[PDB]
Design a protein around this ligand. Structure first.
Ligand SMILES: Nc1ncnc2c1ncn2[C@@H]1O[C@H](COP(=O)(O)OP(=O)(O)OP(O)(O)=S)[C@@H](O)[C@H]1O
Ligand SMILES: Nc1ncnc2c1ncn2[C@@H]1O[C@H](COP(=O)(O)OP(=O)(O)OP(O)(O)=S)[C@@H](O)[C@H]1O
Ligand SMILES: Nc1ncnc2c1ncn2[C@@H]1O[C@H](COP(=O)(O)OP(=O)(O)OP(O)(O)=S)[C@@H](O)[C@H]1O
Ligand SMILES: Nc1ncnc2c1ncn2[C@@H]1O[C@H](COP(=O)(O)OP(=O)(O)O)[C@@H](O)[C@H]1O
Ligand SMILES: [Mg+2]
Ligand SMILES: [Mg+2]
Ligand SMILES: [Mg+2]
Lengths: 348, 261, 319, 220, 329, 325
DNA sequence: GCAGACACTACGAGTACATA
DNA sequence: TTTTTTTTATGTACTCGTAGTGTCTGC
C-alpha cells in the first residue's frame, strides 16, 4: 500500500484540513433528510475522502468493505456493454462515463432500477441508499437530462453524491437539484503538515524546505504530493533540502513539445509537433490538459505583449475542441496559429 | 352490463387467428340479437363481417347496446393462452373501459381474469348493400384453401371466373399460367365436398392472393364455404358456423388495364 | 369514366410527338423504325420525357408482343438481390418468338433506387443474354448507377427543355383543348415550369380550371415565381456588400411562408454555382454551413438569417 | 476477376494470388480497332474523332463501341466532331481513385482550361464522384504539410485547419441532431485545398495512416 | 416516520400552493371548474415550478385513484424514441376515458400526457406527435415541458398553448421562504433572507435546498448572512479586488497567479463571471471598455455552457479585461 | 352539444367556405372538385395556415359518411410509412377497386416531408400508374425534404401566411360563438402575436379568456409574456441615448418589473433595427451581434450577461453613429 | 397410430448510409 | 507509379442465417 492509501482518514473528525467543513458536513447528514450533494473542486483536494467520511458518518463501518459488481446493459442499438461498479452493503459507486456516449443507457436502465426499489434490511442499513456518480463532468448532456427525474422522484429512498471537478460541465437542471459542496485544494502549509504527519507516522524526518518544494511542485495536489514524497523517500533515504524530485513523463514531454514549437515555425516542424501530439493523445492524456500544458510552457517563452493573445487563442481552440470530436485538428490549428503569431512578432 | 359465455374456447381462437394478420382492431358491436363485428383491414381493401348469435353462447345478457373497439394483438395474446374445451366469459360494464376475459387453465384448476382497455375510435358505419349476386358457389373450404395455396406459388394476382359450368382460377405469372377449373363434385359419399352453382351470369375478376390466403385461414370454422361474385359488388367469402353464427369476407377487385396494341 | 389530368391524358404515344433533345429522340425514332437497339440508360432532369421515350421506343419496337416481350420494373417493386437472380435472369432466359431486329426489353425505371449488389448482379445477365434481350434504364442521378452498368449501356443524357420546346407542346395541348390564352400567360407558364413539362401542364390545367383564361395575373394567382430567381439577386447583393436590398429580398421570402431550411438550401444552391471569386465562394459556403448548423440545431428565426446575410456582407470587406 | 483490388475482402487473396493488374488500353490500338469496326459496318470516321471518343470514354472499348452503335444508326455515314464532343451521348460517370483525386487537388493541370472556375468545378465533381469521403479527408490531412508550401506565414495552413474543423463540426452536428442535410458542405473540403495548395510541382502523395494508427494505439 | 428533504415535502399538492405563476395557475384553476383545457407548453428557467404545477393540476383533476388511468408521464429518464411515440403514446391517446372519482368531485373527460423534458426528444419523434395531438384531442390532452422552446419544433409550438414560467420575484420567493421557515421552527434574520433571495436568483428549489442545508448546519439556531455566504459559494470581494488590481497592474504573471489561486480554491467559473459582470457594470469605466468586456463575458459564459475548460476561459477573460484596463493607462 | 375541446379543434373549417385567406387556391380546388378534375395535390406552407383542414374539407365534400372509410386512406407521421408500406397497404389501396360505390379514391399523406427518400422514390410510379383510380395529396411544411420527382408529379399550392386583415372575421366568429368580451386592441394584439397562424391566435385567445376573462391588449401581453411596443421603444431609446450603467439599470428594472424574456426582446429589437435608418456598416455589426446573442441563449447560459451584451452591441455603435454625422 | 423428413415463414443478427 | 481498420447516436432498409412448425411418408 502506498502513502496515498495507507494514511487516508476514515471519519470526519480525522481530517487534517477543512475541519470547519468537516463539522458542517457532519451536522448536515446527521438527520438523514439531506439533499443530493455535488462535491466539486480541483483534483487531489480530498473530495473522495470526504465523501467516504460522509458515508461512514451515515452508515456503519461496513462502507469500507467494497466489491466489484459487473453489469451488462443493452443499448438501443442492441450492443451489450459491460460496466463495473464499486459496491457495498449500503451504497453503490458507478462511473457511467466508462460507457462513453452510451452513458445515458446507464442512467435510464441501471440507475433507475436502483432508485425504484427499496432496501432489504432497514435496521442495519438506514432508510435510504446512496449512489456515488463519479466524474459527472464527463457525462453527456443526454445522461444529465436522464438524471434529473430520477433524482427528483426517488430522493427519499435513494440519495446521490455526484462528484466532479468543474460545475460548468454540469447542466443547470442538475445543479438546481443538488447542494453544491466546494472542496478547495489544501494550501502549502496544509500539504506540509500532511507530509510531516505522514513522515512522522512512518518514523522518518522531513525538512520544511523539502516539504515546501513538494507542495510547490505538486500544484496543490495532495495525491501527487504524497506520491512524490514517497518516491523521494525511495530514491534517496537521507532527505536533503535540495533533493531532486522525480517528475511525470507526459509533463516533461509536453515541455519538450512546446520547446519544439517555439524553436522553429515551419510546416515541417508543424508535422513533427503533430506527431508529438499524437504521441500524447495515444497515451490517453486528455486534450484539455495537453492544451493547458502547452499554454503554461509557451507563455514562458513569449514577450509581455503577446501572452494575452496566446491565451485567447488557446481558449478559443479549446472551446472548438470541446465542440468537435477530433482533438488533433484543433490542437494543430492552435499550434499553427501560435506559429504564425510568433513568426509575425519575431520578424517585426 | 354485457356478459357473453363461449361454451368452448376453440372457435374464438380460430376467429382471432383468422383475422390476426388482417384486422387492425376489433369492433364488437353488442346488441340483444348477438355480437356483430364490421371492420376493415389496414389497407382498406378487405372487410370482415362476423355475426355471432345469442343462442350459441352459454349465457348471454345485454341490457344496453355497446360498441367495444379493442386492439387485436392484445386479444390475440390473451386468446393464445386459452383452452379449446373450457368456458370463456366475456364481461363488460356500462361505463367502464375493462373488457374482461375470464377462463380456466389447461390444467383446469385455477381461474384467469385478463382485462383489456377499450379504444375510443369513432368509426362511421359501413353500409353493407346486401344485394343479389350474379354468382353463388357452394364449395368445400379445404379445397378452396388448397387451390389458393397452389396458386400462390405461381403468381400474385389471380383471375377467378364463374359461369354455368363452375368456378375457374387462373394465375398468369412468371413461371407461366395455371388454370384450375372445378365443377359438379357432389357425387361423393361426403356432403361437405360438393360444388354447387346457383346463379347465371358469368363474371371474371382479379384479386390479390394474400387476402384470399388470409381469408382461407377460417377453414376449421366451416366445412362448406360460399363464394358470391358479381360485376359490381365485391367478392364475398361466407363461412357458416354450425350453431354460433357466420363470417363474411369482402374483397375488392384489382384495377386491370387492357393493352392498347 | 373519369377524365385524366393533362399530364397523363396528353402523354405522347409516338416518338415524334416528344419535344426536346432532337438528336437523341430522332435516333430513337430511327431505332424504333429499324431495330437492333443497344442497351440504353437515359439520365436527366425530372419531367424531361425519359420514361415517355423508353415506353414509346419499347411499344414501337414490339407492337402486339408488348405484354409477353417486355418486363417493366419500378421502385415500387422489390427489385432486390433476389429479383435480379430469379426474375430478371429468368426473363432474359425466357424464349419469346419475335421478328428480326427485335428483342425482349427489360425496362428498369428509376435505377437509382437499386442497391449496389443488385447492379453488380445485373452485369453478367446483361452481358450474356444480349443476343435475345435488351435493357432500357431511366434515371435522374447518373452517379447512382455504377460504372460497369454505364459501360454496358449507351448513356444518353437529356438536358432541360427550352422555352420554345415547352411552348410547342403547350400550343399542341391548347389547340387540342381549346384553351383561350394570351402571350404573357404562356410566358408566365414557361417561367413557372422551369424546364419541366409536368409542371407546365399542371400549371396550365390549374389556371384553366380555376379561371378559364391564361394571362399573367391568372397564372400568378395560383402558381408561384421560383425561389432561386430571387435568391440569385440577394446573393448578388451580398457580394456587393449591400445589406439593405439583401434583407429586402430575405424579408420578401420570409413573408411568403418559406421555412429557413428551404431559404438556406436555395442560398447554398445559388452560392455553389455563383460567378464570383473562388476563395470568397468558399468563405460564403463555410458561413452558410455554420448558419445551417444553427438552423438544424433548433434556432431558426429571421434574426439568424439576417445575421447570415450580415456575415456574408462582412466576408466581402475583410480580405 | 475484379474491378477494385483494394477491397477489404480480397487482401488475404492478394498475399496468395498471381496478381495481374490491367493497364488502360493503348489509344492507337483502340482507334485502329474502332476504325476496322466502322469499315466493317460501312461507316466513315477520321482517326481524330475516334481519338476524341477514346479520350471521352477513358479508353473503354465497350463504351466506345456502344457509343458508335448509337451514333451511327443508318441516317448518316460520316461521324462529326461535335457529335462526339457533345455531352448528350457517350459520357459516363467514372469512379476516380483516391490518388487521382489527391493528384488533382495538390497539382495544377499542365498547360480553354486555364480558368479557375473550371478547375474549381472539376475538382469538386471529382471529389464528389470518387466516394469514400473520410479517406479523402484523412489523405488531405496527412499530405498537405509535406508539400513545398509557398505560404511562409502559415495562413493557408491555418485556414485549411479551420476547414478541417468545419468538416468535423458538420459531421458531429449531423450525427447528433440527425440532420444529414448538413452533409452537402464537407464535399467542399477537397476543393478548398485546391484553392490553397495548388502547385505546378510533382508532389509525392502517400496513403493516410496516422489517424488509424493513433486510433489503434489509443484503443490498445 | 422517515425524514424527507424539503424540496419534496413542500412540493405543491394543489394548484393554490404554486407561487407567482399567476396566468398558468389561473388557467388551470379555470380548467378545474370545467373549462376547456387546451394543450400546454410550459417553458422557462429551472426551479420555477413547471413539473409541480402540472402534477398539482393532475392531482386536483383526477384525484388519487385516477392518476394511473388518466395520466401518462414520460420524461428523459425513460426511452422516448420514434417507436415510443408511434406505439405507446398513440395507443394511450386512443384509449377510452373511463373511471370516475369516488369522493364525488367532478372529473374531466380527457386524459393527460405529460411529456416532461421535451428538449431531449428528436425532431422525428416530435413530428410523430402532431396528428396524435390533433386527432385524439377529444379524449386526451398534452403538456410538453421544456427549458428551451427553440428545441421544440414549430408545429408542436403551434399546437400547444405556450406558457413561460418567469423567475420568481424577491417578494414572492421571500414570502414562501419565510412561510417554510415558520413551518419548520427555524429563525432566519432579515439580512440572511435578503442574501438568500439574492443568491437563489429566482430558483425556488435552490432556495429551499439552501434553507434546509443552513437549518441542518446550524442545528436550528439563528441563520445569519455568514452561513448563507459560506454555503452559497459566493466569492469574497477581496478576491475580485485582487483580480482587478492584477488586471490594472498590466503584468501577466500576477494575472496567472490570481487565476491559479481562484482555480485552486475551487470557485465555480459561473460565479466568477457573475461577480465580475456586476463589478464591471457597477464601476466608473468607459462605455467602450464596458462594452468589450461584457461582450467577452457573454462569450466566456457561452463557452463555459458548452463544457470548455474553466482555467483557459478565465485566463482569456482576464487577459481581455487586463488589455482594456491597461489601454487607458 | 357542448364538448370539452381546445378551440383549435372545436372550431375547425369543416367546409371550404370556412377558411379565410387563400381564396384563389380554394376556388381552383372547388372547381377541380365540381368538374371531377382533381389532380395529385402538393400543399406546402408555414404551420397553422389550413392545409390539413383544406384536405379534410375536400375529402368530406367528395365522399359521404356511409363510404368515407373505403375511399380515403389518410396516413401521417404518427403512422409507419416505410417502403414496405408503400409496397404494401398503399399499393394495394391504389391498385384495387372500391367496395361499396364506384368512384375515385384519395390517399392523403400528411407530413410528407417526414417520409424517407426510399418511400418517396417508391411513390412515383404508384402516383403515375394509378392516376385514373386514385389521387394523392402530399402536404408538407418544408418543400426541400420532398424529392423533385414528387414535386413534378403533384401540382403545388403555397398556403402562405394568413394576412391579419383576413384573420379578423374568423376570430370574430369564434368570439361570438364563445361569448368573449374583446376590445379592438385585443384583436389587434391577437393578430399581431399570431403572425400568420390561426392555431396560435386561437390558443392565445383561449388562454387569455381562461386566465383573465377579458381579452384586451394588456391581458394578451400579460398572458403571453410578450413585451409591448412601448417597452421595446424605451429599451432602444435607453440603449442609444445614455451610458452603459444607466441603460443597464433601466432595462434591468423594466425586465424585473414586467417579467420579460430576452428572446422576444431580441426579436423586436431586430425588427426595429431595420426601420431605424442606420448606416450600412452599423447595421451589419448590429445584426451579427444580435444573431450571436440569440445563438448564445439556446443553452444553459446566464441571461443577465446576455442582456449586458445586448446593451454592449449598441453602446459600441453610439459614438460611431454620432461621429458619422 | 407415431417417428422421421420436407419446406414454410417469423425472427435474430450483421452492415451501410443518411447531401447536391 | 504510393492501402487498415473501430469509434460517431437514431432510423431505415437490405441481406442472410437460424429455428419452431404445419404437413407429408411410411410400417
Ligand atoms: N419531351 C416531352 N414531350 C412531351 N410531353 C412531355 C415531355 N416530357 C414530359 N412530358 C409530359 O410529362 C409527362 C411525364 O413525363 P415522364 O417521361 O414521366 O417524365 P420523366 O422524364 O420520366 O421524369 P422523371 O425523372 O421520371 S419524374 C408525360 O406523360 C408527358 O405528358
Ligand atoms: N412556483 C412554485 N411554488 C411553490 N414551490 C415551488 C415553485 N417552484 C418550485 N417550487 C419548489 O421547488 C421544487 C422544484 O420544482 P419543479 O417543479 O421540479 O421545478 P421545475 O420547473 O421542474 O424545474 P426544471 O426545469 O424541471 S430543472 C418543487 O418541488 C417545490 O418544492
Ligand atoms: N384558414 C383557416 N381558417 C380557419 N381556421 C384555420 C385556418 N388555418 C388554421 N386554422 C385553425 O388551425 C387549426 C389547424 O390548422 P391546420 O389544418 O393544422 O393547418 P396547417 O397549415 O395544415 O398546419 P400544419 O402545417 O400541418 S402544423 C384549424 O382546425 C383551425 O382551428
Ligand atoms: N484530511 C486529509 N488528511 C490526510 N490525507 C488526505 C486528507 N484528505 C485527502 N487526503 C489524501 O489526499 C488524496 C486526495 O485524493 P481524493 O481523496 O481521491 O480526492 P480527489 O477525488 O479530489 O482526488 C487522497 O489520496 C488522500 O489519501
Ligand atoms: Mg419516369
Ligand atoms: Mg421538471
Ligand atoms: Mg396539419
Amino acid at each position: 500500500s502506498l502513502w496515498v492509501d495507507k494514511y487516508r482518514p476514515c471519519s470526519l473528525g480525522r481530517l487534517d484540513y477543512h475541519k470547519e467543513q468537516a463539522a458542517q458536513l457532519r451536522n448536515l447528514v446527521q438527520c438523514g433528510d439531506f439533499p443530493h450533494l455535488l462535491v466539486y473542486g480541483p483534483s487531489g483536494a480530498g473530495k473522495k475522502t470526504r465523501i467516504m467520511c460522509i458515508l461512514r458518518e451515515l452508515y456503519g463501518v461496513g462502507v469500507e468493505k467494497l466489491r466489484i459488481e459487473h453489469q451488462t446493459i443493452t443499448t438501443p442499438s442492441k450492443k451489450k456493454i459491460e460496466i463495473s461498479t464499486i459496491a457495498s452493503n449500503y451504497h453503490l459507486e458507478v462511473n457511467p462515463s466508462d460507457a462513453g456516449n452510451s452513458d445515458r443507457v446507464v442512467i435510464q436502465e441501471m440507475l433507475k432500477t436502483v432508485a425504484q426499489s427499496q432496501q432489504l434490511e432497514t435496521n442495519s442499513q438506514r432508510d435510504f441508499k446512496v449512489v456515488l456518480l463519479t466524474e459527472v463532468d464527463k457525462l453527456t448532456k443526454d445522461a444529465q437530462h436522464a438524471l434529473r427525474r430520477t433524482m427528483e422522484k426517488y430522493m427519499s429512498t435513494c440519495r446521490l453524491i455526484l462528484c466532479c471537478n468543474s460545475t460548468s460541465k454540469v447542466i443547470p437542471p442538475i445543479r438546481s437539484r443538488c447542494l453544491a459542496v466546494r472542496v478547495p485544494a489544501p494550501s502549502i502549509e496544509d500539504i506540509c503538515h500532511v507530509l510531516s504527519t505522514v513522515c512522522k507516522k512512518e518514523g522518518l524526518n522531513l525538512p520544511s524546505q523539502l516539504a515546501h518544494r513538494l507542495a510547490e511542485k505538486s500544484c496543490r495536489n495532495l495525491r501527487k504530493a504524497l506520491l512524490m514524497c514517497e518516491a523521494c523517500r525511495v530514491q534517496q533515504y537521507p532527505f536533503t533540502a535540495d533533493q531532486e524530485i522525480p517528475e511525470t513523463d507526459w509533463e516533461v514531454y509536453l515541455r519538450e513539445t512546446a520547446n519544439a514549437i517555439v524553436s522553429q515555425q515551419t510546416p515541417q516542424r508543424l508535422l513533427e509537433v503533430r506527431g508529438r501530439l499524437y504521441e500524447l493523445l495515444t497515451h490517453c492524456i486528455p486534450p484539455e490538459i495537453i492544451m493547458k500544458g502547452l499554454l503554461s510552457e509557451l507563455l514562458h517563452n513569449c514577450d509581455g505583449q503577446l501572452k494575452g493573445e496566446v491565451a485567447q487563442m488557446a481558449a478559443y481552440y479549446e472551446h472548438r475542441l470541446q465542440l468537435g470530436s477530433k482533438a488533433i485538428y484543433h490542437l494543430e490549428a492552435f499550434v499553427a496559429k501560435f506559429m504564425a503569431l510568433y513568426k509575425k512578432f519575431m520578424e517585426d | 352490463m354485457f356478459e357473453a359465455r363461449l361454451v368452448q374456447g376453440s372457435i374464438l381462437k380460430k376467429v382471432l387467428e383468422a383475422l390476426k394478420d388482417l384486422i387492425n382492431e376489433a369492433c364488437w358491436d353488442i346488441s340483444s340479437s348477438g355480437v356483430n363485428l364490421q371492420s376493415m383491414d389496414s389497407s382498406h381493401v378487405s372487410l370482415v363481417q362476423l355475426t355471432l348469435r345469442s343462442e350459441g353462447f352459454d349465457t348471454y345478457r345485454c341490457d344496453r347496446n355497446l360498441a367495444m373497439g379493442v386492439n387485436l394483438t392484445s386479444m390475440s395474446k390473451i386468446l393464445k393462452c386459452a383452452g379449446n374445451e373450457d368456458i370463456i366469459t366475456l364481461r363488460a360494464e356500462d361505463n367502464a373501459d375493462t373488457l374482461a376475459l375470464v377462463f380456466e387453465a389447461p390444467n383446469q384448476e385455477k381461474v384467469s381474469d385478463y382485462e383489456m382497455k377499450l379504444m375510443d375510435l369513432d368509426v362511421e358505419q359501413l353500409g353493407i348493400p346486401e344485394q343479389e349476386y350474379s354468382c353463388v358457389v357452394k364449395m368445400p373450404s379445404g379445397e378452396f384453401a388448397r387451390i389458393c395455396r397452389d396458386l400462390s406459388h405461381i403468381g400474385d394476382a389471380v383471375v377467378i371466373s364463374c359461369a354455368k359450368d363452375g368456378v375457374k382460377f387462373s394465375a398468369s405469372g412468371e413461371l407461366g399460367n395455371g388454370n384450375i377449373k372445378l365443377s359438379q363434385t357432389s357425387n361423393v359419399d361426403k356432403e361437405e365436398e360438393a360444388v354447387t352453382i346457383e346463379m347465371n351470369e358469368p363474371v371474371q375478376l382479379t384479386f390479390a392472393l394474400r387476402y384470399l390466403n388470409f381469408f382461407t385461414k377460417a377453414t376449421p370454422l366451416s366445412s362448406t364455404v360460399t363464394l358470391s361474385m358479381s360485376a359490381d359488388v365485391p367478392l364475398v367469402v361466407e363461412y357458416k358456423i354450425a350453431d354460433m353464427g357466420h363470417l363474411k369476407y369482402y374483397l375488392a377487385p384489382k384495377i386491370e388495364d387492357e393493352e392498347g396494341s | 369514366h373519369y377524365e385524366l389530368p393533362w399530364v397523363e391524358k396528353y402523354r405522347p404515344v409516338k416518338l415524334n410527338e416528344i419535344v426536346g433533345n432532337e438528336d437523341t429522340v430522332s435516333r430513337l425514332e430511327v431505332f424504333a423504325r429499324e431495330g437492333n437497339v443497344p442497351n440504353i440508360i437515359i439520365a436527366g432532369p425530372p419531367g424531361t420525357g425519359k420514361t415517355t421515350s423508353i415506353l414509346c421506343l419499347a411499344r414501337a419496337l414490339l407492337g402486339p408482343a408488348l405484354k409477353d416481350a417486355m418486363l417493366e420494373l419500378n421502385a415500387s417493386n422489390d427489385r432486390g438481390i433476389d429479383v435480379v437472380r430469379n426474375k430478371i435472369k429468368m426473363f432474359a432466359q425466357q424464349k419469346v418468338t419475335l421478328p428480326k431486329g427485335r428483342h425482349k426489353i427489360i425496362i428498369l425505371d428509376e435505377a437509382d433506387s437499386m442497391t449496389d449488389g443488385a447492379q453488380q448482379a445485373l452485369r453478367r445477365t446483361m452481358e450474356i443474354y444480349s443476343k435475345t434481350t435488351r435493357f432500357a434504364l431511366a434515371c435522374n442521378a447518373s452517379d447512382k448507377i455504377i460504372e460497369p452498368i454505364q459501360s454496358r449501356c449507351a448513356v444518353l443524357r437529356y438536358t432541360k427543355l427550352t422555352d420554345a420546346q415547352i411552348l410547342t407542346r403547350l400550343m399542341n395541348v391548347i389547340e387540342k383543348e381549346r384553351v383561350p390564352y394570351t402571350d404573357d400567360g404562356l410566358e408566365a407558364i414557361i417561367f413557372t415550369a422551369q424546364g419541366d413539362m409536368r409542371q407546365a401542364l399542371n400549371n396550365l390545367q390549374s389556371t384553366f380550371s380555376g379561371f378559364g383564361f391564361i394571362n399573367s395575373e391568372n397564372v400568378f394567382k395560383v402558381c408561384d415565381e421560383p425561389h432561386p430567381l430571387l435568391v440569385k439577386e440577394m446573393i448578388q447583393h451580398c457580394v456587393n456588400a449591400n445589406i439593405d436590398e439583401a434583407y429586402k429580398i430575405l424579408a420578401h421570402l420570409w413573408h411568403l411562408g418559406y421555412s429557413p431550411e428551404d431559404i438556406i438550401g436555395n442560398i447554398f444552391r445559388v452560392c455553389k454555382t455563383f460567378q464570383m471569386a473562388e476563395y470568397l465562394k468558399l468563405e460564403f459556403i463555410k458561413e452558410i454551413g455554420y448558419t445551417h448548423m444553427k438552423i438544424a440545431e433548433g434556432v431558426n428565426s429571421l434574426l439568424q438569417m439576417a445575421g447570415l446575410l450580415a456575415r456574408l456582407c462582412q466576408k466581402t470587406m475583410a480580405p | 476477376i475484379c474491378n477494385d483490388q483494394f477491397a477489404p475482402s480480397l487482401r488475404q487473396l492478394k498475399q496468395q494470388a498471381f496478381l495481374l493488374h490491367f493497364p488502360p488500353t493503348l489509344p492507337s490500338r483502340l482507334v485502329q480497332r474502332l476504325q476496322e469496326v466502322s469499315l466493317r459496318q460501312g461507316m466513315r470516321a477520321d482517326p481524330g474523332v475516334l481519338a476524341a471518343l477514346c479520350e471521352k470514354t477513358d479508353n473503354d472499348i465497350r463504351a466506345c463501341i456502344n457509343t458508335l452503335q448509337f451514333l451511327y444508326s443508318r441516317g448518316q455515314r460520316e461521324l462529326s466532331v461535335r457529335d462526339v464532343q457533345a455531352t448528350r451521348v457517350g459520357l459516363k460517370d467514372q469512379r476516380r481513385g483516391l490518388f487521382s483525386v489527391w493528384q488533382e487537388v495538390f497539382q495544377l493541370p499542365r498547360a480553354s482550361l486555364t480558368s479557375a472556375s473550371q478547375r474549381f468545378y472539376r475538382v469538386l465533381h471529382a471529389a464528389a464522384s470518387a466516394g469514400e469521403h473520410e479517406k479523402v479527408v484523412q489523405g488531405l490531412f496527412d499530405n498537405f504539410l509535406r508539400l513545398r508550401l509557398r505560404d511562409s506565414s502559415l495562413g493557408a495552413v491555418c485556414v485549411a485547419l479551420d476547414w478541417l474543423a468545419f468538416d468535423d463540426l458538420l459531421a458531429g452536428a449531423a450525427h447528433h441532431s440527425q440532420s444529414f442535410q448538413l452533409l452537402r458542405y464537407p464535399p467542399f473540403l477537397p476543393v478548398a485545398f485546391h484553392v490553397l495548395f495548388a502547385s505546378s510541382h510533382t508532389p509525392r502523395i502517400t496513403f493516410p495512416s496516422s489517424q488509424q494508427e493513433a486510433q489503434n494505439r489509443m484503443s490498445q | 416516520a422517515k425524514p424527507v428533504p424539503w424540496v419534496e415535502k413542500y412540493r405543491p399538492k394543489c394548484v393554490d400552493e404554486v407561487a407567482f405563476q399567476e396566468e398558468v395557475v389561473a388557467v388551470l384553476k379555470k380548467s378545474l371548474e370545467g373549462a376547456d383545457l387546451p394543450n400546454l407548453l410550459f417553458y422557462g428557467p429551472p426551479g420555477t415550478g413547471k413539473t409541480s404545477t402540472i402534477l398539482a393540476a393532475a392531482r386536483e383533476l383526477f384525484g388519487p385513484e385516477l392518476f394511473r388511468l388518466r395520466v401518462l408521464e414520460l420524461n428523459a429518464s425513460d426511452e422516448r424514441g420514434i417507436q415510443v411515440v408511434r406505439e405507446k403514446v398513440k395507443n394511450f391517446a386512443q384509449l377510452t376515458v373511463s373511471g370516475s372519482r369516488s369522493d364525488g368531485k367532478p372529473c374531466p373527460p380527457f386524459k393527460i400526457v405529460i411529456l416532461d423534458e421535451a428538449d431531449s426528444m428528436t425532431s422525428a419523434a416530435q413530428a410523430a406527435l402532431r396528428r396524435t395531438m390533433e386527432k385524439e384531442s377529444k379524449t386526451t390532452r398534452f403538456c410538453l415541458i421544456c427549458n428551451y422552446v427553440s428545441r421544440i419544433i414549430e408545429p408542436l409550438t403551434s399546437r400547444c398553448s405556450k406558457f413561460r414560467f418567469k423567475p420568481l420575484s424577491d417578494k414572492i420567493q421571500q414570502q414562501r421562504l419565510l412561510d417554510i421557515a415558520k413551518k419548520e421552527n427555524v429563525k432566519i434574520s432579515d439580512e440572511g433572507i435578503a442574501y438568500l433571495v439574492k443568491v437563489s436568483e429566482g430558483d425556488l428549489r435552490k432556495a429551499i435546498t439552501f434553507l434546509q442545508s443552513a437549518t441542518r448546519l446550524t442545528g436550528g439556531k439563528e441563520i445569519t448572512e455568514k452561513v448563507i455566504t459560506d454555503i452559497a459559494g459566493v466569492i469574497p470581494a477581496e478576491k475580485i479586488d485582487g483580480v482587478f488590481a492584477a488586471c490594472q497592474s498590466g503584468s501577466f504573471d500576477k494575472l496567472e497567479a490570481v487565476v491559479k489561486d481562484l482555480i485552486d480554491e475551487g470557485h465555480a467559473a459561473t460565479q466568477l463571471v457573475n461577480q465580475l459582470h456586476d463589478v464591471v457594470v457597477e464601476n466608473n469605466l468607459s462605455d467602450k471598455q464596458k462594452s468589450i468586456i461584457t461582450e467577452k463575458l457573454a462569450e466566456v459564459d457561452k463557452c463555459l455552457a458548452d463544457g470548455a475548460d474553466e482555467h483557459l476561459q478565465l485566463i482569456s477573460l482576464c487577459a481581455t479585461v487586463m488589455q482594456q484596463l491597461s489601454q487607458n493607462c | 352539444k357542448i364538448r370539452n375541446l381546445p378551440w383549435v379543434e372545436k372550431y375547425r373549417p369543416q367546409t371550404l367556405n370556412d377558411l379565410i385567406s387563400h381564396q384563389d387556391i380554394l376556388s381552383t380546388i372547388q372547381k377541380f372538385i365540381n368538374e371531377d378534375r382533381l389532380p395529385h395535390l402538393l400543399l406546402y406552407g408555414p404551420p397553422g395556415t389550413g392545409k390539413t383542414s383544406t384536405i379534410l374539407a375536400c375529402a368530406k365534400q367528395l365522399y359521404k359518411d356511409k363510404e368515407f372509410g373505403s375511399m380515403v386512406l389518410e396516413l401521417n407521421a404518427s403512422d409507419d410509412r416505410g417502403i414496405d408500406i408503400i409496397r404494401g397497404p398503399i399499393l394495394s389501396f391504389a391498385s384495387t377497386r372500391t367496395i361499396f360505390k364506384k368512384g375515385f379514391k384519395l390517399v392523403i399523406l400528411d407530413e410528407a416531408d417526414a417520409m424517407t427518400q426510399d418511400a418517396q422514390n417508391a411513390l412515383r410510379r404508384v402516383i403515375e400508374k394509378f392516376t385514373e383510380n386514385t389521387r394523392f395529396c402530399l402536404i408538407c411544411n418544408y418543400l426541400s425534404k420532398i424529392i423533385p420527382a414528387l414535386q413534378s408529379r403533384c401540382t403545388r399550392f403555397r398556403f402562405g401566411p394568413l394576412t391579419p386583415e383576413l384573420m379578423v372575421p374568423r376570430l370574430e366568429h369564434v368570439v361570438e360563438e364563445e361569448k368573449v368580451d374583446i376590445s379592438e386592441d385585443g384583436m389587434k394584439a391577437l393578430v399581431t402575436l399570431s403572425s400568420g397562424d390561426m392555431r396560435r391566435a386561437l390558443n392565445i385567445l383561449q388562454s387569455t379568456n381562461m386566465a383573465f376573462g377579458k381579452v384586451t391588449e394588456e391581458t394578451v401581453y400579460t398572458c403571453t409574456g410578450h413585451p409591448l411596443k412601448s417597452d421595446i421603444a424605451n429599451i432602444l431609446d435607453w440603449m442609444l441615448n445614455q451610458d452603459f450603467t444607466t441603460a443597464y439599470r433601466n432595462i434591468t428594472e423594466l425586465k424585473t418589473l414586467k417579467g420579460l424574456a430576452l428572446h422576444d426582446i431580441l426579436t423586436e429589437i431586430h425588427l426595429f433595427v431595420h426601420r431605424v435608418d442606420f448606416p450600412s456598416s452599423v447595421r451589419i455589426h448590429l445584426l451579427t451581434k444580435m444573431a450571436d446573442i440569440e445563438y448564445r441563449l439556446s443553452v444553459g447560459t446566464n441571461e443577465k450577461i446576455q442582456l449586458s451584451s445586448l446593451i454592449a452591441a449598441f453602446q459600441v455603435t453610439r459614438d460611431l453613429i454620432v461621429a458619422e454625422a
